[PDB]
Enzyme design. Structure first.
Site, PDB file in Angstrom:
ATOM      1  N   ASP A 123      25.986  18.222  -6.192  1.00 28.52           N
ATOM      2  CA  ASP A 123      25.574  18.108  -5.034  1.00 28.52           C
ATOM      3  C   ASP A 123      25.093  17.225  -4.329  1.00 28.52           C
ATOM      4  OD1 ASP A 123      25.752  19.541  -2.369  1.00 28.52           O
ATOM      5  OD2 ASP A 123      24.122  20.671  -3.619  1.00 28.52           O
ATOM      6  N   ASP A 137      27.413  16.096   2.171  1.00 27.03           N
ATOM      7  CA  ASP A 137      27.402  17.078   1.307  1.00 27.03           C
ATOM      8  C   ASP A 137      28.985  17.013   0.550  1.00 27.03           C
ATOM      9  OD1 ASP A 137      27.264  19.208  -0.296  1.00 27.03           O
ATOM     10  OD2 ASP A 137      26.617  20.742   1.259  1.00 27.03           O
TER      11      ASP A 137
END
Ligand SMILES: COCCCOc1ccccc1N1CCN(C[C@H](N)[C@@H](O)C[C@H](C(=O)NCC(C)(C)C(N)=O)C(C)C)CC1=O
Ligand SMILES: *[C@@H]1O[C@H](CO)[C@@H](O)[C@H](O)[C@H]1NC(C)=O
Length: 340
Positions: free
Chosen positions: A38, A226
């Site tokens: 992430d 993201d």
């Protein structure tokens, strides 16, 4: 900054085009965990054996047991990670982590409190923050940094490849290259955009056009790339104008359209400083049918992110799938290229 001559790839598994995870090993002997890489955060964490079984999410995911690791180093300071979509809490710990052949002494979070939503829907166990240290909660050094300290990676960068087809075994789920990119997975040239501010993989976005009429982000806005996000998200405001144009019904956690409408939705474009990144109906529609009697869901939900980072669009898997992404820590920029 010491650069060596080593590259490392992490094979990823693709689950329904909504979850991409690889495997890391924490402790000695290794305890393998399925984790999400992430770029939206900077902390590493996995469910802990010390997690109350009253949390069904812990009963359904692999737990780290420090008692079985001879390299475990105790720290124990409290730790809480608040994501736009959930929250986990626990304490700090240190151990050796293996990722793509690389072994680095990392300081991770041992989550003892993980709520059903969303993690009970997680096909993986934890998260590996790929963000900068400035965002690392508890000022803990992010894992990529520690590895960059080993002066082994050829370049202070790392790329992501999310595959379009999900289940089919035979096909490669996804891939992450540590220390560079894998040219076998993209074509044409990269195109970069500078980060507005460092510490965050967020870039400036000049506009968002739905079809022909650039009816969104007319005054420019922010796009946070993201990798730990499934869809493309925008402020509830933006997404309402966006969805009105697609004639999509606003359901509780996503938008839909009669499956037959799918193939007729216009192209959506994001003007990321320099080039125009275009998606077609098929690129953001889950065409799991073609009838008027069924509902198809879009891979672009609405999601508001709290400052000082938000408000902001977040370009996740939906976007990445089409464009191979490179995260350049040295020149603080993100490179985009057509994933093939
Ligand atoms: C490819 O995988 C597809 C994603 C699948 O998603 C899931 C499925 C089921 C259960 C959990 C998740 N995940 C993955 C991890 N994630 C993390 C999320 N990406 C955050 O990083 C978002 C980020 C943020 O809130 N940062 C945390 C904070 C505020 C502490 C910071 N470092 O700034 C914003 C800014 C986009 C939140 C999340 O649901
Ligand atoms: C945890 O890590 C911090 C950061 O260096 C350190 O100052 C602290 O003492 C550690 N906690 C303990 C005492 O185990």
């Amino acid at each position: 900054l010491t650069l060596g001559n080593t590259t490392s790839s992490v094979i990823l598994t693709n689950y329904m085009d909504t979850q991409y995870y690889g495997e890391i090993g924490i402790g000695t002997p290794p305890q393998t965990f399925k984790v999400v890489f992430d770029t939206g955060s900077s902390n590493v964490w996995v469910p802990s054996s010390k997690c109350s079984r009253l949390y069904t999410a812990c009963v359904y995911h692999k737990l780290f047991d420090a008692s079985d690791s001879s390299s475990y180093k105790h720290n124990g300071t409290e730790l809480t990670l608040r994501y736009s979509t959930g929250t986990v809490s626990g304490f700090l710990s240190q151990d050796i982590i293996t990722v793509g052949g690389i072994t680095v002494t990392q300081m991770f979070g041992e989550v003892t409190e993980m709520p059903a939503l969303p993690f009970m829907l997680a096909e993986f166990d934890g998260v590996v923050g790929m963000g900068f240290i400035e965002q690392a909660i508890g000022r803990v050094t992010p894992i990529f940094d520690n590895i960059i300290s080993q002066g082994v990676l050829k370049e202070d960068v790392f790329s992501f490849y999310y595959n379009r087809d999900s289940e089919n075994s035979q096909s490669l789920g996804g891939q992450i290259v540590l220390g560079g990119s894998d040219p076998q997975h993209y074509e044409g040239n990269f195109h970069y955009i500078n980060l507005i501010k460092t510490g965050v993989w967020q870039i400036q976005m000049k506009g968002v056009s739905v079809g022909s009429s650039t009816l969104l982000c007319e005054d420019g806005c922010l796009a946070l790339v993201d990798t730990g996000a499934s869809y493309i998200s925008g402020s509830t405001s933006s997404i309402e104008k966006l969805m009105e144009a697609l004639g999509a019904k606003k359901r509780l956690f996503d938008y839909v359209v009669k499956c037959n409408e799918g193939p007729t939705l216009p192209d959506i474009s994001f003007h990321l400083g320099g080039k125009e990144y275009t998606l077609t109906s098929a690129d953001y529609v889950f065409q799991e049918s073609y009838s008027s009697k069924k509902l198809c869901t879009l891979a672009i939900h609405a999601m508001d992110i709290p400052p000082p980072t938000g408000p902001t669009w977040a370009l996740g898997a939906t976007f990445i799938r089409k464009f191979y992404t490179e995260f350049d820590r040295r020149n603080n920029r993100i490179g985009f290229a057509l994933a093939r």
